[PDB]
Design a protein around this ligand. Structure first.
Ligand SMILES: *[C@@H]1O[C@H](CO)[C@@H](O)[C@H](O)[C@H]1NC(C)=O
Ligand SMILES: [Zn+2]
Lengths: 194, 596
C-alpha cells in the first residue's frame, strides 16, 4: 500500500503556522518519485538526507508537518534561522535531517476581499524549542505593568492574520509548506521505497 | 522591558494592522480611479475613513512612548512620524470651521464661472475654457479678459475665506508646537539628533534665498530674451525696460512659460525632434512603451517590474465600459503590489512620462523593505526629482537612437540643442522665481509680516521685484490673486517644486559623472551604466530611514541643496542668451505698469 502523501500535499486546507499540523507516516511504501520531479515546488531543500536517493532506504518513523506562510518567510523554514515564524511559530532544529518543500498557493488561499483564515503568532515570552507548538491565546505583556487579560496599551493579542489577497506581491502571497522529518532507529521500520 | 523595547513591540503591532488597512484603502481607491461608480465612491470613502480613524488612535498611542527615551534612530523616526501624523489638537468647532472653509475654497475654484461681456449666458470655467485662452490665445484683449475676470469673479470670493484660513491654520500649527503654518510646512526638511546632518526649519529659507541669488543672472537673461520676442508679438503693449504683463505668460498665472515657446523659439525653421511618428510606424503600443521603460531601468542594474505590475496596472483607457481618472500616477498599495495608472497613447510625451512614473515605482520598490512608516521619499522633493531624471535621459537623442526611434545617422545641430534648451528653460527656469515668490508671500503672510491690509500691495510688489511681472490692471485688497492658483486655495505646499528642481539636476549631474559622460550635461543618457544605477539605488533603498541630507550625500557627495548643477545644465543656453541680449536691456524697472 502507498503512503498517504496525497492527503498531505493535496489537502483542501492547510493549518495556520502557529497551529501547524503534524502527521506521522508509517506502514506504507513511499513513492518519492512523484515528489522531487513535480516541477511545481518553488522550494525543495533537503538537509542531511539526499533527494532522488530517499527511494532506497527504509525509515523508522517519517513525520510530515504542514502549514501556510508568506513567501518572504519560507527562508525561515531552515536550520538555525531567525524571524517571527522561526522564533514564535515553527522552529526547525539546527541539526535537522529532512526536506523542506514549499509551493505558491495564491490560487487556493487568496480571496479578493482578503483571506483571514491563516494566522501567525507575533509575540511570545521566549523562542520556540525545535518542533514545539504554541496555540494559546493569552494576552502578551509588552511592558512591566501587568495586563490581567485586558487588551490595551502594551497588552496585545498574540495572533495576527495574513489577509491573503491575489493581488499581493509574491513575497506576501501564501505559500504552502510541507516539512518531512526522517528518523531511523532499531524499531519496526515501515517506511520504505519501491 | 525598557521603553525602547516596548515601543518596538508597539510598532510591530502597528506595522501589521497599518499594512492591512492601508492596502484596503488603496485597493478601494484604485477601484474608484479605474472605475468611477457610486458604489466605488462609497467603498473608497469607508475604507479611507477606517484608515483615518486608525491613524488617529495610533498617533495618540505613539505619543505615550516619549521620544527622548528612545535611542535607536530607526525606532525614533517611526514614532515621530506617527506622533505628528494623525494629530488633531484643534478644537472640535474650529476643526469643523476650518474644514468647511477648505471645502468652500475648493468648490469655488472648481466651479467658478466667468461670463462673456457680450453674452451673460456664454460662461467659461477655468478647467477647459479660461486655461485654453491663457495657453493658446495671441489676442491681447482676450487674454486680459480671462486673466482679470478670473481674479474678479473667483478671486474676490476667496479673499474673505483665505483671511480666516490663515488664522485657523496658524492655530493648528501652534497646537503642533510650530510657530505658524509656514513653519509647519517647512518642518518637512527638519533634522534633529544626527550630528553633522542636522537641518533647522529656518535654514530652508536662507538656503532657498541663497541658491536663488545665483539663479537671478540666468533668469534675467531669459527674461530679457522673452521680453524682446514679446514686443514683436504685442507691439506697443510691452516696455523694453519694464516687467512682463501677467496675462501674456502662457498660463493663468505665469507658473510656467512653456506656451511662450512658439513666440520665443530661437530657430523657428528647425523643428524640435519628435519620435511620435516613429512609434506609430513601428507599431508601438502602450505595452511596448512600458516594456521599453522597463528595459531602461534594467540596463542600469535596477529590477524588472513585478509580474503583478503587468497584470494589475491600467496602461490604457478602459473605454466606454469603465470611466477612469486619466491622470498618470504610480501606485504603491503595499504588500508588494505596485501598479501604474495611465491612459497611455502612442506619443513621445506619454513615452517620457512612462519613464517618469516607472521611476516612482523603482523608488517605491527600493524602499519596500523599510518599515511601513519609513516607506516614503527622503523629503517632499525627492520622489518627483527621481521621476524627472528618468525623463531627462530617455528624451536625449543618444537614447532615442539606441532604441530605434531616431535614425542611426541623425545629426544634432547646435540650433536644435538651443531650441531644446530654451523650451526647457521656459518650463524649468521660468517657474523658479514664480515658485520662490509665491511661497515667500505665503510664509510672510502666515507669520504676520504682511498684514491683510497690504496683501495685494505686497503681492504685486514682489511679483515686480522678484519675478519681473506686472499686473495689467491695479488690484486693491478686495482681490486675492494668490488664491486664484489651485495650490494656494486647495491648501498645498509649494516650495517642493523649487527644491525638487534643484535636486533633479544634482542627481543627474552626479549620475552622469558615474556614467562617465563627457559632453555637456544636457546630452547625457545614464543608460547601460551599472555604476549610475547603484549610486541612485544606494539612496532609493533608504526611504525616510535617514535624514534627507544624508540621502542626498549618497548620490551627490554633498549634504545640502546646491544650484550649480542646474546652472551647468543651462550653460549652453546661458552663453547664447547673453549674446542675444547685447542690444537689449537686461533686468527690469519696477515702476512701469501697463495701466500707468
Ligand atoms: C495532487 O493531485 C493531482 C491530481 O489532481 C496529481 O496530479 C498530483 O500528482 C497530486 N500530488 C501529489 C503530491 O500526490
Ligand atoms: Zn511624478
Amino acid at each position: 500500500n502507498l503512503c498517504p502523501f496525497g492527503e498531505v500535499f493535496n489537502a483542501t486546507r492547510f493549518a495556520s503556522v502557529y497551529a501547524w499540523n503534524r502527521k506521522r507516516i508509517s506502514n506504507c511504501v513511499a513513492d518519492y518519485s512523484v515528489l522531487y520531479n513535480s516541477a511545481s515546488f518553488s522550494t525543495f531543500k533537503c538537509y542531511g538526507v539526499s533527494p532522488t536517493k530517499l527511494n532506497d532506504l527504509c525509515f523508522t518513523n517519517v513525520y510530515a508537518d504542514s502549514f501556510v506562510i508568506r513567501g518572504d518567510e519560507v527562508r525561515q523554514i531552515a536550520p538555525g534561522q531567525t524571524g517571527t515564524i522561526a522564533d514564535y511559530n515553527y522552529k526547525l532544529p539546527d541539526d535537522f535531517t529532512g526536506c523542506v518543500i514549499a509551493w505558491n498557493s495564491n490560487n487556493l488561499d487568496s480571496k479578493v476581499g482578503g483571506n483571514y483564515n491563516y494566522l501567525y503568532r507575533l509575540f511570545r515570552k521566549s523562542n520556540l524549542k525545535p518542533f514545539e507548538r504554541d496555540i494559546s491565546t493569552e494576552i502578551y505583556q509588552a511592558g512591566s505593568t501587568p495586563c490581567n487579560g485586558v487588551k490595551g496599551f502594551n497588552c496585545y493579542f498574540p495572533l495576527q492574520s495574513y489577509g491573503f489577497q491575489p493581488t499581493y506581491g509574491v513575497g506576501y502571497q501564501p505559500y504552502r509548506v510541507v516539512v518531512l522529518s526522517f528518523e531511523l532507529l532499531h524499531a519496526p521500520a515501515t517506511v520504505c521505497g519501491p | 522591558s525598557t521603553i525602547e523595547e516596548q515601543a518596538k513591540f508597539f510598532l510591530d503591532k502597528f506595522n501589521h494592522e497599518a499594512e492591512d488597512l492601508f492596502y484596503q484603502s488603496s485597493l478601494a481607491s484604485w477601484n474608484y480611479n479605474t472605475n468611477i461608480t457610486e458604489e466605488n465612491v462609497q467603498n473608497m470613502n469607508n475604507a479611507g475613513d477606517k484608515w483615518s480613524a486608525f491613524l488617529k488612535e495610533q498617533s495618540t498611542l505613539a505619543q505615550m512612548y516619549p521620544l527622548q527615551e528612545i535611542q535607536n534612530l530607526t525606532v525614533k523616526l517611526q514614532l515621530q512620524a506617527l506622533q505628528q501624523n494623525g494629530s488633531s489638537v484643534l478644537s472640535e468647532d474650529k476643526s469643523k470651521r476650518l474644514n468647511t472653509i477648505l471645502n468652500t475654497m475648493s468648490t469655488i475654484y472648481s466651479t467658478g464661472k466667468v461670463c462673456n461681456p457680450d453674452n451673460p449666458q456664454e460662461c467659461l470655467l477655468l478647467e477647459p475654457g479660461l486655461n485654453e485662452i491663457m495657453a493658446n490665445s495671441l489676442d491681447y484683449n482676450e487674454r486680459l479678459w480671462a486673466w482679470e475676470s478670473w481674479r474678479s469673479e473667483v478671486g474676490k470670493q476667496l479673499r474673505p475665506l483665505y483671511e480666516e484660513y490663515v488664522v485657523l491654520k496658524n492655530e493648528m500649527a501652534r497646537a503642533n508646537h510650530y510657530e505658524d503654518y509656514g513653519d509647519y510646512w517647512r518642518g518637512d526638511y527638519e533634522v534633529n539628533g544626527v550630528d553633522g546632518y542636522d537641518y533647522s526649519r529656518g535654514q530652508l529659507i536662507e538656503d532657498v534665498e541663497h541658491t536663488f541669488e545665483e539663479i537671478k543672472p540666468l533668469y534675467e537673461h531669459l527674461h530679457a530674451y522673452v521680453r524682446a520676442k514679446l514686443m514683436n508679438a504685442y507691439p506697443s503693449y510691452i516696455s523694453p525696460i519694464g516687467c512682463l504683463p501677467a496675462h501674456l505668460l502662457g498660463d493663468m498665472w505665469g507658473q510656467f512659460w512653456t506656451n511662450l515657446y512658439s513666440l520665443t523659439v530661437p530657430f523657428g525653421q528647425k523643428p524640435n525632434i519628435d519620435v511620435t511618428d516613429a512609434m506609430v510606424d513601428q507599431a508601438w503600443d502602450a505595452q511596448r512603451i512600458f516594456k521599453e521603460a522597463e528595459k531602461f531601468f534594467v540596463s542600469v542594474g535596477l529590477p524588472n517590474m513585478t509580474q503583478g505590475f503587468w497584470e494589475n496596472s491600467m496602461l490604457t483607457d478602459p473605454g466606454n465600459v469603465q470611466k477612469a481618472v486619466c491622470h498618470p500616477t504610480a501606485w504603491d498599495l503595499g504588500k508588494g503590489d505596485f501598479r501604474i495608472l495611465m491612459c497611455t497613447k502612442v506619443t513621445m510625451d506619454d513615452f517620457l512620462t512612462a519613464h517618469h512614473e516607472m521611476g516612482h515605482i523603482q523608488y517605491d520598490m527600493a524602499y519596500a523593505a523599510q518599515p511601513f512608516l519609513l516607506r516614503n521619499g527622503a523629503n517632499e522633493g525627492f520622489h518627483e526629482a527621481v521621476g524627472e531624471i528618468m525623463s531627462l535621459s530617455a528624451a536625449t537623442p543618444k537614447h532615442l537612437k539606441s532604441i530605434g526611434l531616431l535614425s542611426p545617422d541623425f545629426q544634432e545641430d547646435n540650433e536644435t540643442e538651443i531650441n531644446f534648451l530654451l523650451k526647457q528653460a521656459l518650463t524649468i527656469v521660468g517657474t523658479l522665481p514664480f515658485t520662490y515668490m509665491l511661497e515667500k508671500w505665503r510664509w510672510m503672510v502666515f507669520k504676520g509680516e504682511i498684514p491683510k491690509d497690504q496683501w495685494m500691495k505686497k503681492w504685486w510688489e514682489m511679483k515686480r521685484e522678484i519675478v519681473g511681472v506686472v499686473e495689467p490692471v491695479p488690484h486693491d485688497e478686495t482681490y486675492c490673486d494668490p488664491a486664484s492658483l489651485f495650490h494656494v486655495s486647495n491648501d498645498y505646499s509649494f516650495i517642493r517644486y523649487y527644491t525638487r528642481t534643484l535636486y533633479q539636476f544634482q542627481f543627474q549631474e552626479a549620475l552622469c559623472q558615474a556614467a562617465k559622460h563627457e559632453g555637456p550635461l544636457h546630452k547625457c543618457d545614464i543608460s547601460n551604466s551599472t555604476e549610475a544605477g547603484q549610486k541612485l539605488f544606494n539612496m532609493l533603498r533608504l526611504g525616510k530611514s535617514e535624514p534627507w541630507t544624508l540621502a542626498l550625500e549618497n548620490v551627490v557627495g554633498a549634504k545640502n541643496m546646491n544650484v550649480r548643477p542646474l546652472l551647468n545644465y543651462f550653460e549652453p543656453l546661458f552663453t547664447w542668451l547673453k549674446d542675444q541680449n547685447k542690444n537689449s536691456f537686461v533686468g527690469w524697472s519696477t515702476d512701469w505698469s501697463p495701466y500707468a
